């Protein structure tokens, strides 16, 4: 059962129990006791309820079959290539304050919580996913991650993809070559050669998952909102852990239910509630705080311009007949992601403005984690443009510590009061 699996993975059982102990109460308060949630949330509720169970069993069984488990922290790492071989790709961006002090044993305290928390999970041996992973694929995005990989490599082999910092022709070729080098790495480690059939199948599997999430995002444009944003965030978070085929089926089953709600004009709020767009950094599970506060004040979050959100699923791979072309197309897909580690990053602004209009947003909340300098600095020019377009804008920052609620509530609620 679960506890024997964690033992074989060399999980620190006591620290892990301590980490998981408060989670059911929080999930009860923020999810299960919230009314009018779609029936199709039951699958995702059960995933959270056994978050370190059945999926971790699946990954362990894949390794005993000779497959591998690749851990990633950025949407730029090509899931299509890993899944082509029948290995697993999981995303282990950290979202927990519990592990931050452990991360600070080797990292500066003035650093993104996402990075510190992930490092602490691996160091304390608290996470069964991090324990079952064979490899970490890092990328050269923000400063903290780039330099963290050097340290993390002492605990788990880290392969570091060099992502460039512009999107010119030279950059796109450089990234193409990085993608082909990574393809070779995967082949070597798995012993599974990429060919037209298995790469096509891997592309198809991940396009299906993205398409599912795109379908769910689109349904949020309706009025009244058919689903609270917090439920969608959760679903986008679990995209990084779940089986992609099952996950896509369950997302699509939810969309069918939401379509019926839309057809009957049913929603989770009244048509007068303020519709909010979140933009900024990803919110990894269980960093639910900002959604929870907005929707507990009577707002509804109707989209996330973030990598646990729109930036993850909006762009699909285009098909091609051979491996060479599919690999070029996989590189191109990821370079559509308008992350603030690129300069300039004007496409992200275009995305935000388009989402405001497609989602009929009453206000934009720009949320970035403390000490995330790419999104922290870029927030100035984003705010300046939304201001001159008369789009209400609130800039928020926090870390994973859950108890700064009062400060965040006053700022959020004053904003909602203002835009009513």
């Amino acid at each position: 059962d679960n506890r024997e699996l964690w033992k074989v993975l060399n999980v620190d059982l006591e620290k892990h129990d301590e980490f998981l102990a408060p989670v059911p109460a929080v999930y009860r308060e923020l999810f299960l006791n919230r009314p009018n949630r779609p029936r199709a949330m039951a699958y995702f509720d059960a995933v959270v309820g056994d978050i370190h169970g059945i999926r971790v069993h699946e990954l362990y069984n894949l390794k005993q079959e000779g497959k591998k488990v690749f851990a990633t922290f950025c949407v730029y790492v090509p899931e299509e290539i890993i899944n082509a071989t029948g290995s697993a790709c999981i995303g282990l961006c950290g979202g927990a304050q519990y592990t931050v002090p452990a991360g600070e044993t080797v990292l500066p305290r003035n650093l993104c919580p996402l990075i510190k928390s992930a490092m602490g999970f691996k160091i304390e041996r608290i996470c069964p996913y991090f324990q079952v992973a064979d490899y970490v694929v890092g990328e050269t995005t923000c400063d903290g991650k780039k330099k963290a990989w050097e340290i993390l490599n002492e605990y788990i082999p880290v392969y570091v993809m060099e992502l460039p910092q512009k999107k010119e022709e030279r950059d796109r070729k450089f990234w193409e070559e990085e993608i082909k080098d990574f393809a070779q790495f995967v082949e070597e480690k798995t012993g599974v050669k990429l060919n037209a059939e298995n790469l096509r199948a891997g592309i198809e599997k991940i396009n299906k998952k993205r398409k599912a999430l795109k379908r769910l995002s689109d349904l949020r444009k309706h009025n009244p909102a058919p689903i609270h944003g917090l439920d969608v965030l959760l679903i986008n978070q679990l995209a990084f852990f779940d089986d992609p085929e099952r996950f896509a089926t369950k997302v699509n089953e939810l969309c069918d239910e939401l379509e019926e709600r839309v057809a009957k004009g049913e929603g989770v709020v009244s048509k007068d509630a303020p519709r909010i767009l979140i933009t900024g950094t990803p919110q990894p599970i269980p960093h639910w705080k900002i959604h929870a506060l907005i929707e507990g004040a009577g707002g509804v979050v109707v989209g996330e311009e973030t990598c646990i959100g729109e930036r993850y699923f909006k762009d699909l791979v285009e098909p091609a007949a051979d491996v060479e072309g599919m690999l070029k197309n996989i590189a191109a897909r990821s370079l559509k992601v308008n992350c603030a580690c690129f300069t300039p990053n004007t496409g992200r602004l275009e995305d935000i403005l388009s989402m405001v209009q497609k989602l009929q947003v009453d206000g934009v909340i720009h949320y970035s984690l403390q000490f995330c300098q790419p999104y922290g600095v870029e927030s100035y020019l984003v705010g300046r443009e939304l201001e001159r377009r008369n789009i209400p804008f609130l800039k928020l920052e926090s870390d994973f510590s859950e108890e700064d609620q009062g400060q965040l509530k006053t700022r959020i609620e004053a904003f909602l009061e203002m835009i009513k």
Partner: protein, 243 residues
């Protein structure tokens, strides 16, 4: 008859507007227990028709219409200074810059970032320790207003310790803290636009040297309400009556 209760981090304030349009006000320390402070303030108040509760303790007080201190401060300051569009409210834990329209409604606002929390409480604490057995009037033309880190109260506290540890004047450090705070709050109060004139309110406005330094840095007139502690509570009471 119409009550506004402002349950702040540091002080809790109650304004009562009577049928004849006049009002009374009471302030008591919060003592980290806003429920107790609100019950105490409402003790013997009379029959209340409408109540609005604001501040941090609004999340816990079990009656009254809830409204944020941003909206209340705008409304209250509008009652006093309809002709001034910008408000700086310095409290014990938060700083707020607010721009209001000709009806006193919020057009835009900004609160301190996380690293700028606690400015007012730090001023309260350090002034009690190194005293100010001088009178405010003397910090204004100090020759040595030693510059002190504006980053946060942790960095500033460190410098205060080292500066007094090596024999720097008490007054010079006090002057330095007020000038650094004023320079930071001057930039802050321009965040929504350059005010032609600024209302400075909240308890932090009750430091006359801070107001003078702020006004010199900003280069425009800074008006302080006759009782800056209660302006947000007045706004709550006005909203309660309007409601």
């Amino acid at each position: 008859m119409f009550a506004g209760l402002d349950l702040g981090s540091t002080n809790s304030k109650l304004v009562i507007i009577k049928e004849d349009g006049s009002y009374t006000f009471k302030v008591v320390p919060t003592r980290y227990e806003p429920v107790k402070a609100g019950e105490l303030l409402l003790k013997n108040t009379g029959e209340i028709r409408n109540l609005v509760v604001t501040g941090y303790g609004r999340v816990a007080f079990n009656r009254g219409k809830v409204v944020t201190e941003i909206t209340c401060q705008a409304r209250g300051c509008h009652e006093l200074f309809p002709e001034v569009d910008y408000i700086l409210d310095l409290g014990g834990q938060d700083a707020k810059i607010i721009k209001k329209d000709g009806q006193g409604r919020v057009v835009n606002f900004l609160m301190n970032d996380k690293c700028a929390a606690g400015t007012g409480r730090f001023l309260e604490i350090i002034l009690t320790a190194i005293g100010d057995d001088y009178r405010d009037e003397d910090l204004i033309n100090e020759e040595n207003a030693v510059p002190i880190n504006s980053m946060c109260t942790v960095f500033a506290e460190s410098e205060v310790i080292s500066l007094l540890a090596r024999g720097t004047s008490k007054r010079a450090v006090i002057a330095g803290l007020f000038k650094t705070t004023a320079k930071r709050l001057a930039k802050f109060a321009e965040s929504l636009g350059k005010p032609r004139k600024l209302i400075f309110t909240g308890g932090g406005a009750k430091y006359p040297a801070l107001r003078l330094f702020l006004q010199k840095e900003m280069g425009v007139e800074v008006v302080v309400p006759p009782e800056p502690s209660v302006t947000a509570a007045l706004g709550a009471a006005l909203i309660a009556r309007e409601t």
